Structure formats: C-alpha cells, structure tokens
Amino acid sequence: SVYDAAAQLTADVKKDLRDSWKVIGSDKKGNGVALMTTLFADNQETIGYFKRLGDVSQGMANDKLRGHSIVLMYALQNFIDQLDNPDDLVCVVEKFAVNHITRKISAAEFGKINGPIKKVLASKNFGDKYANAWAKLVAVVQAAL
Amino acid sequence: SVYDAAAQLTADVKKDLRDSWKVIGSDKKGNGVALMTTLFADNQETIGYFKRLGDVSQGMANDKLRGHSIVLMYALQNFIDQLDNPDDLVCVVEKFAVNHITRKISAAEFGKINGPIKKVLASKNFGDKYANAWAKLVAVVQAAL
Numbered sequence A, B: 001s002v003y004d005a006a007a008q009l010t011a012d013v014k015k016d017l018r019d020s021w022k023v024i025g026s027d028k029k030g031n032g033v034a035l036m037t038t039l040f041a042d043n044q045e046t047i048g049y050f051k052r053l054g055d056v057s058q059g060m061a062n063d064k065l066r067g068h069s070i071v072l073m074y075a076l077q078n079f080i081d082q083l084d085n086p087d088d089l090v091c092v093v094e095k096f097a098v099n100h101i102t103r104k105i106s107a108a109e110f111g112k113i114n115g116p117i118k119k120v121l122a123s124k125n126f127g128d129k130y131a132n133a134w135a136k137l138v139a140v141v142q143a144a145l
Ligand code: HEM
Pocket: A046, A049, A050, A052, A053, A068, A071, A072, A073, A075, A076, A096, A099, A100, A103, A105, A109, A110, A111, A112, A113, A138, B098, B099
C-alpha cells in the first residue's frame, strides 16, 4: 500500500534524495528533457503513450515535449518538498496517481523511469547509492498505481 | 493565444508577481487550501467539478483536497519561475491547459479563481496592485482555454 511504501523512506534515503535533487533540480528544463529522451531511447515502446507530444526526437526543439518535461520536474520538486511529512507525501502521491491510473500506466510501466533517472544521476556523478534512493521514491508512486 | 497574453506581463507586473509569491509560496499547503476553500465558498457551483475530492467541507483535514491544493501551488510555482522566458512560459501554460480543456473548464469558469487569489493576497496584506498582477497571469492561462 502507499502508506507502507512511504515508510521505506528512511533518514538516509531522504538525505540522499535531497542532496542529489539539489544538483538535478537546478536545471529543470535540461534534466527533464534529458530524462524524457532517455526514456524514449531506452524504452521505445512508451512513445505510444505520448502521441500528443508529436515528434519526440526533436528533444528540446519540440515545445510540447519541453512543456511536459518542465512540468514533470515540478512534480519531483513537490515530492522532495513533502519528505518531512509522510501524510502530505502520500496525499500528493495519490493525487498525482489519478491521471496515470486514467491512462492505464501500470506500476511496472511507471518503473521504466528508473533507468533514465540512474543515467541522469550518473551523468552528474551520483552513482548507485543515489539511483537506489530514487527507486524507493518511485516505488511509493508504483504502490499507488 | 498565449503569446499575446504573455506580452501583458511587463517588468512591473513580473516584479509584483515574484514579490507576492515570495510570501504566498512559502506555505503551499496552507495558502493552497485557503484558495480552494475560498473558491468553494464564493462560487459554490465550482464544487461540481470536484466530486472526486469528496467532503470538501473538511478543508485541510480532507486528504484529497489537501493533496489537490498542494499540487495546484506547484503549477503556480512553475509559472512564476518561467516569467523571464516567454517561450517556456507559453509551452508550460499550454501543457497545463490540456487537462483543463478536457474537463470543459472555459476561460470564464477558470476566471472564477481571481476573487480567491485577491482574498488570499489581501490576508497577507498584498492590495489591489498585486491582485491586478495575478489577474494578468491568470489571463495568460485563460488565453490557452
Ligand atoms: C517519476 C516520473 C514521472 C513523473 C514525475 C511524471 C509526471 C507527470 C506530470 C506532472 C504530468 C502532467 C499532469 C498529468 O497530466 O498527470 C504527467 C503526464 C503524463 N505522464 Fe507522467 N510522470 C512520470 C512518469 C511517466 C511514465 C513513466 C509514463 C508512461 C510510460 C507517464 C505517462 C504520462 C503521460 C502519457 C502523460 C501525458 C502527457 C501529455 O500528453 O501531455 N508518466 N506525468
């Protein structure tokens, strides 16, 4: 359940999430677009969900993809800001989940973002330790799907 | 047509938007729920769009309303941060508009949030100067609807 998954975010996971977000979140447009292009590159099959974005290969030059990528990074910002209060993190994760559930994005499909996150982390010198902390955060959303 | 509406956000409007946001944005849960409960109070018919939230009368204690309210404030956070680059502001406002258009929220209905914003600003002592600035940011989204 999302309440149990939220409890897996221990003191050090929360700290590692904040320390990496300090760097990754500093450029929301650049890192969000990079995150989305790595998803489409590594997992071609997910492009079908993003039919409305159009020609995804354009990356930064595609205004709709760029709009989506910036908005996606503010959802992550929101999750990092709610780490102090589990009750607030959960109601925000469940609110967030509504539109993904409507789109029939399963917990296994959502989990495809973990590879993109690990790769963007690694480009900014945050290795496995931080990739694993971000996968526990993604798991709280997966439990709500 | 969002670009022309964005041209009304002159240097002084953008300054008033960033100064009032420095205070309104510092308690996203508190001010976010204040906005939504003022909306429901002054325009009770808007509650018809929010059946999913359930018992909106519980205010802050209703986890779904609190969840929606915090997410709303991150959309405003996003807009405030894009004020100096019209191209990013417009692709974010068009991205934001997509789900509001699908919900059949017209520019006129969306415009009902201006009275709430003016009251929340006035409770933290930002007068008409600031209310007018925020009305012009809302007009940019109204132009996408
Ligand atoms: C941690 C990663 C993710 C975050 C933070 C995230 C965030 C968001 C946000 C904030 C929106 C806009 C609001 C909404 O309509 O719900 C959105 C839209 C969307 N998300 Fe996610 N999402 C993530 C991963 C995914 C994945 C992995 C998929 C599917 C493979 C997905 C599919 C969608 C789709 C199709 C849209 C609509 C895009 C459009 O047509 O504009 N999301 N997501």
